[PDB]
CSV table of C-alpha atoms and ligand atoms in Angstrom, one decimal:
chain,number,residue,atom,x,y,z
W,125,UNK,CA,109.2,83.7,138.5
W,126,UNK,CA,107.2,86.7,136.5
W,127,UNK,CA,107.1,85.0,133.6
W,128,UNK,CA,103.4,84.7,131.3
W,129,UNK,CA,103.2,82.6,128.7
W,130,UNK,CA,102.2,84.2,125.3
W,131,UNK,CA,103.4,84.2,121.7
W,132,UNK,CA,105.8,87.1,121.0
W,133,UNK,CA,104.5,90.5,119.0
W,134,UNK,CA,103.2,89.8,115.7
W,135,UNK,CA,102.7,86.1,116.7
W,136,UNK,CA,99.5,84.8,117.1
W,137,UNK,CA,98.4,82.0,120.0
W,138,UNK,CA,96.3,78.8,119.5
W,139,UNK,CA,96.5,75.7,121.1
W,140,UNK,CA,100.1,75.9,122.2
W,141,UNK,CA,101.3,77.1,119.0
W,142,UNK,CA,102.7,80.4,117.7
W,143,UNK,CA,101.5,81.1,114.1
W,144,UNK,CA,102.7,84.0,111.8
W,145,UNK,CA,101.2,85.0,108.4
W,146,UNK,CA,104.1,86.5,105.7
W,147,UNK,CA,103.3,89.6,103.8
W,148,UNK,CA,105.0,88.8,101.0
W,149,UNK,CA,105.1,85.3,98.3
W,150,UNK,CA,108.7,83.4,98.3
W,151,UNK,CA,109.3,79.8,97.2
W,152,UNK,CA,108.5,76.8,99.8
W,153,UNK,CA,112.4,76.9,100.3
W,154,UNK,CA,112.8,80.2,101.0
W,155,UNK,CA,109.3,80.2,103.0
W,156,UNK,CA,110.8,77.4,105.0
W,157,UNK,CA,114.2,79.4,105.5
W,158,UNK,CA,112.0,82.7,107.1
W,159,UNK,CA,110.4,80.4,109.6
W,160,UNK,CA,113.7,79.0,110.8
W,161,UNK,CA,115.3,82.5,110.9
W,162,UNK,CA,112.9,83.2,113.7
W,163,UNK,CA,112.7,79.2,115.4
W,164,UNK,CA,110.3,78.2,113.6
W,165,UNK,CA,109.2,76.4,110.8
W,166,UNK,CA,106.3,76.2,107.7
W,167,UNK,CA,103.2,75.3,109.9
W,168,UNK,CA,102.5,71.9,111.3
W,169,UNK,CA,99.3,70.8,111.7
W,170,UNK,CA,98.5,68.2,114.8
W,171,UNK,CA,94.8,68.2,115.0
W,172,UNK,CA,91.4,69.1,113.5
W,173,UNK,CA,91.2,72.8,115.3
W,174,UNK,CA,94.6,73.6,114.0
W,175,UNK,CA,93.2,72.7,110.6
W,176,UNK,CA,90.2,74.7,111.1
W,177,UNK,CA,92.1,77.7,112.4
W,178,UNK,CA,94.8,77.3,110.1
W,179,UNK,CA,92.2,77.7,107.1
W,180,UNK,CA,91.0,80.6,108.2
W,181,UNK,CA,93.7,82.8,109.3
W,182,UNK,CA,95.2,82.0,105.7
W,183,UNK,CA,92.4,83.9,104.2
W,184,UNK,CA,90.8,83.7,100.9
W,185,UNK,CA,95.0,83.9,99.5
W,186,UNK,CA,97.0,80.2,98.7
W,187,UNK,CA,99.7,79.9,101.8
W,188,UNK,CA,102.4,77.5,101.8
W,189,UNK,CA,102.4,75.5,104.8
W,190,UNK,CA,105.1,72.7,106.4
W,191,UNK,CA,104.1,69.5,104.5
W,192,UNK,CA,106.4,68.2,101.6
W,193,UNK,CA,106.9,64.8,99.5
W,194,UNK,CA,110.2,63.7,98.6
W,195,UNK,CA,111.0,60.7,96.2
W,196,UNK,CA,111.2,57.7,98.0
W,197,UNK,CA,109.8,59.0,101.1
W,198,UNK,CA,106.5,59.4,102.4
W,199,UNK,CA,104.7,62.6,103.4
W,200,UNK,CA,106.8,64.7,106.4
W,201,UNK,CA,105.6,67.5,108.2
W,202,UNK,CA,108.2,70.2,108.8
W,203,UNK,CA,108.6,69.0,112.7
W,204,UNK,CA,109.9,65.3,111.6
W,205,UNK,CA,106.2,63.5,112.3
W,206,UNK,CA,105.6,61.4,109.1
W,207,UNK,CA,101.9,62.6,107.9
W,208,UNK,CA,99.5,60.0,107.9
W,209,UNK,CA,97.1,60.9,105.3
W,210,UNK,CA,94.3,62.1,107.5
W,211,UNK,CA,93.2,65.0,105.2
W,212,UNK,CA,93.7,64.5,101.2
W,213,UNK,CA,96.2,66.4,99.4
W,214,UNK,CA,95.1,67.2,95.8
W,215,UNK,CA,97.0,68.3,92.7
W,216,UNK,CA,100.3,67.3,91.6
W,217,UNK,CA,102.8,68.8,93.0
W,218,UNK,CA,105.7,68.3,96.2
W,219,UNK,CA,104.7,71.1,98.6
W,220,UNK,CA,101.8,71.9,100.3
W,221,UNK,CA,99.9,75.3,100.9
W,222,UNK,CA,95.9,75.8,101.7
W,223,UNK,CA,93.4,78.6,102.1
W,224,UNK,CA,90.0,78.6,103.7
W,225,UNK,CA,88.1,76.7,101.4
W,226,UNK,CA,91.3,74.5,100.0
W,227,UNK,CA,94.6,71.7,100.8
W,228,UNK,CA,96.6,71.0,97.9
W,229,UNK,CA,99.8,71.5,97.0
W,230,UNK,CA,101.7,73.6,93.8
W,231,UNK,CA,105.1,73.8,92.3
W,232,UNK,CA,107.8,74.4,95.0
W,233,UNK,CA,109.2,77.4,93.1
W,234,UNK,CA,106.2,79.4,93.2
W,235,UNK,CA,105.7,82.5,94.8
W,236,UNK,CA,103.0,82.2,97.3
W,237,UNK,CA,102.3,83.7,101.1
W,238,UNK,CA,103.5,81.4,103.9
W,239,UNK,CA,102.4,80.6,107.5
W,240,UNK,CA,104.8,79.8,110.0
W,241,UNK,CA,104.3,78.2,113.2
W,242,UNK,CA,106.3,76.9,116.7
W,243,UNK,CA,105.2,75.4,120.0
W,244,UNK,CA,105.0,77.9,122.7
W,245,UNK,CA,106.1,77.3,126.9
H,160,UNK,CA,100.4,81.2,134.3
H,161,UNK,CA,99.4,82.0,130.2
H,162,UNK,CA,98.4,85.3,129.0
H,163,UNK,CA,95.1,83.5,126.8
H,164,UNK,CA,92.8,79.9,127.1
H,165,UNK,CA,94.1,78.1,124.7
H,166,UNK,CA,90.8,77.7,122.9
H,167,UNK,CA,91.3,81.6,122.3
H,168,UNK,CA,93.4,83.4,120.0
H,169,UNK,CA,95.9,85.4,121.2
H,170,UNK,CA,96.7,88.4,119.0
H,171,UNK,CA,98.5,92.1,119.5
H,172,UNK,CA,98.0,91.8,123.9
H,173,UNK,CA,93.8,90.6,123.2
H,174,UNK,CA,92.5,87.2,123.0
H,175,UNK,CA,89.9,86.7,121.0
H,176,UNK,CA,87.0,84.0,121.3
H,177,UNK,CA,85.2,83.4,117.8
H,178,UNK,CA,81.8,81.7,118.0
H,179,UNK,CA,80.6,78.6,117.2
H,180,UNK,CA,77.0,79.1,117.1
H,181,UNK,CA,74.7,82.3,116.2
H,182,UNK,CA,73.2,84.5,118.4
H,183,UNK,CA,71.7,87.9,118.4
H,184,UNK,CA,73.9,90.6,119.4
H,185,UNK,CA,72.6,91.4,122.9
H,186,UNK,CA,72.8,87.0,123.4
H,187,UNK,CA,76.3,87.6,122.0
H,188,UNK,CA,77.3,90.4,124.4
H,189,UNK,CA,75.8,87.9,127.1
H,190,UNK,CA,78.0,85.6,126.3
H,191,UNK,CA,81.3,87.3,126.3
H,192,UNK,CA,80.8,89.2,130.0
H,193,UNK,CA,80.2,85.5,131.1
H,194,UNK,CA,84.2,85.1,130.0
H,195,UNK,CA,85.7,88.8,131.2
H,196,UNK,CA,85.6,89.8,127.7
H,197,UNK,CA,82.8,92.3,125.6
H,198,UNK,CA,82.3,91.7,122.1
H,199,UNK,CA,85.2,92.9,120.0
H,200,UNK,CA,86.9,96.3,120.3
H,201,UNK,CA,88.9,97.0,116.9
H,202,UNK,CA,91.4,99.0,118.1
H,203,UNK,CA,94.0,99.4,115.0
H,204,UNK,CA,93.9,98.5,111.2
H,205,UNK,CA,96.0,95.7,112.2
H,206,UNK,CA,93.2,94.5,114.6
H,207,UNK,CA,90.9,95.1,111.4
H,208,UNK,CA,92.4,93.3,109.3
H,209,UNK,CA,93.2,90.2,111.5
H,210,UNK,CA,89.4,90.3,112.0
H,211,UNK,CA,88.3,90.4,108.8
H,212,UNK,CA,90.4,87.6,107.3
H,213,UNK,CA,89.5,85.3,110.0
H,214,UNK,CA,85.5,85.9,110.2
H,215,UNK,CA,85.4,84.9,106.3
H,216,UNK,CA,82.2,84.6,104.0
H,217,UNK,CA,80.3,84.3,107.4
H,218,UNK,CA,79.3,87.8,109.1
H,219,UNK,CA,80.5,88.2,112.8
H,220,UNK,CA,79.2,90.3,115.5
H,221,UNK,CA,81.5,93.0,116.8
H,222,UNK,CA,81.7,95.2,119.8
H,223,UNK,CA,79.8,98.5,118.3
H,224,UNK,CA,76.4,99.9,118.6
H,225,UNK,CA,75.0,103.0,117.8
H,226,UNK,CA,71.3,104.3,119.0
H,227,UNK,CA,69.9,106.9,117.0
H,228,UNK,CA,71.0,110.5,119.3
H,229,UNK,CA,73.9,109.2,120.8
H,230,UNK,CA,77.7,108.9,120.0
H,231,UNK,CA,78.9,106.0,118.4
H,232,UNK,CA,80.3,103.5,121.3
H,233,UNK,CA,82.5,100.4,121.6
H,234,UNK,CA,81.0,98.1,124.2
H,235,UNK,CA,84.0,99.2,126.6
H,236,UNK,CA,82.5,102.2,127.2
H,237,UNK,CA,85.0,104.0,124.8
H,238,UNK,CA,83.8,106.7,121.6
H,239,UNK,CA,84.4,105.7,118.5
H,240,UNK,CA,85.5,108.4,116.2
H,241,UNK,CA,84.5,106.3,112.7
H,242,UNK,CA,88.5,105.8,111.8
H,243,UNK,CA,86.6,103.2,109.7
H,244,UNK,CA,82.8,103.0,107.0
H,245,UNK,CA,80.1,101.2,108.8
H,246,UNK,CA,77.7,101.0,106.0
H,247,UNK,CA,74.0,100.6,106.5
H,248,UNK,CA,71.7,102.1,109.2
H,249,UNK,CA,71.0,99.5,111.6
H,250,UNK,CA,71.9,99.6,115.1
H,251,UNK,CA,74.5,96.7,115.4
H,252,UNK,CA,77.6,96.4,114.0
H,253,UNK,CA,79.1,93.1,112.2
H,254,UNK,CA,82.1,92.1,109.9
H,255,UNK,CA,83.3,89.6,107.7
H,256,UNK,CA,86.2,89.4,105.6
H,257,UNK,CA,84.3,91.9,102.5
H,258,UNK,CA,82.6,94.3,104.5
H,259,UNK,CA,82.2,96.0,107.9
H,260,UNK,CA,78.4,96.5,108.1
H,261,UNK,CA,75.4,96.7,110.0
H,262,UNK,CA,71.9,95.0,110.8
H,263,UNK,CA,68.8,94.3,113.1
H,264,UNK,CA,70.0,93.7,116.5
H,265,UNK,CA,67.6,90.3,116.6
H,266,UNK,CA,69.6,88.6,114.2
H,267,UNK,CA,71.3,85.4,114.8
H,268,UNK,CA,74.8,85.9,113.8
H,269,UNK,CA,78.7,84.6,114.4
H,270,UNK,CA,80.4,86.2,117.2
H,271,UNK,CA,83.8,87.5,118.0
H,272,UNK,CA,84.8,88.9,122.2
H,273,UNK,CA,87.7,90.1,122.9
H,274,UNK,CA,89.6,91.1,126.0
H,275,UNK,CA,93.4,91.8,127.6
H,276,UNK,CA,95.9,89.4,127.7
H,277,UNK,CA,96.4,88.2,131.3
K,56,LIG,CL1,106.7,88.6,105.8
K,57,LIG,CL1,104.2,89.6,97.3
K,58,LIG,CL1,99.7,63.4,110.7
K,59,LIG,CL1,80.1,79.3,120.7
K,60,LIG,CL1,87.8,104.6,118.2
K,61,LIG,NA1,95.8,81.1,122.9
């Protein structure tokens, strides 16, 4: 068995995870429909160091990430783990993006960067 | 058997470690032998950029030193041929996500090693 684990090129690896960063600003939608093109989804965020790493790859520049609030429902992060609130969510809007010195969330039909990210074996 | 810790960042075949506390250069240096790494080597513009985004507002230590009548050198050993500006005219070299830059050597300062994938 030759295999080593590692995130595939132009994927980056923390804690498990595979992360990408877009180049270019889409909708949350069609954000989310890039991520799955390549397995993966609008990033998920399971702990305070994927937080802090998140926030800082993303850069001084708003990027969507996998948290969205539908009517009825509460808070779901893009891998089906209902969100429980542990960091606030400002603003007014459905989806959720951050950068390094902000978590709040815009209009889903706005054009901003995404990140993407998928557990890695 | 993974390529990086995964306290490290994996990125383009390196992993990168990205301090917690600051330290002077040489401390900083120090530190990353410890972990079979030397401060960073920027090898592309992708490299670069990845670096500068991620340091931020807060200046980080990098893997270049230059004494007055020598070449410049990355702390692998390998000449650097100034593809990029270092501005300033102190010996060590540090970025953040504004400026690649330099200053006194003593200074306590964020720290970035890199070294191969495994
Ligand atoms: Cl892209
Ligand atoms: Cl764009
Ligand atoms: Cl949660
Ligand atoms: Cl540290
Ligand atoms: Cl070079
Ligand atoms: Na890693």
């Amino acid at each position: 068995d030759s295999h080593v684990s590692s995130c595939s090129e132009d994927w980056v690896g923390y804690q498990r995870k595979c992360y990408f960063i877009s180049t270019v600003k889409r909708s949350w939608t069609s954000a989310q429909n890039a991520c799955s093109e390549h397995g993966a989804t609008l990033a998920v965020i399971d702990s305070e160091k994927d937080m802090n790493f998140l926030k800082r790859y993303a850069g001084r520049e708003e990027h969507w990430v996998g948290l969205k609030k539908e009517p009825g429902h509460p808070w779901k992060w893009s891998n089906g783990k209902e969100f429980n609130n542990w960091f606030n969510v400002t603003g007014s809007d459905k989806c959720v993006f951050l950068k390094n010195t902000e978590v709040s969330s815009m209009e889903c039909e706005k054009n901003l960067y995404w990140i993407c990210n998928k557990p890695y074996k």
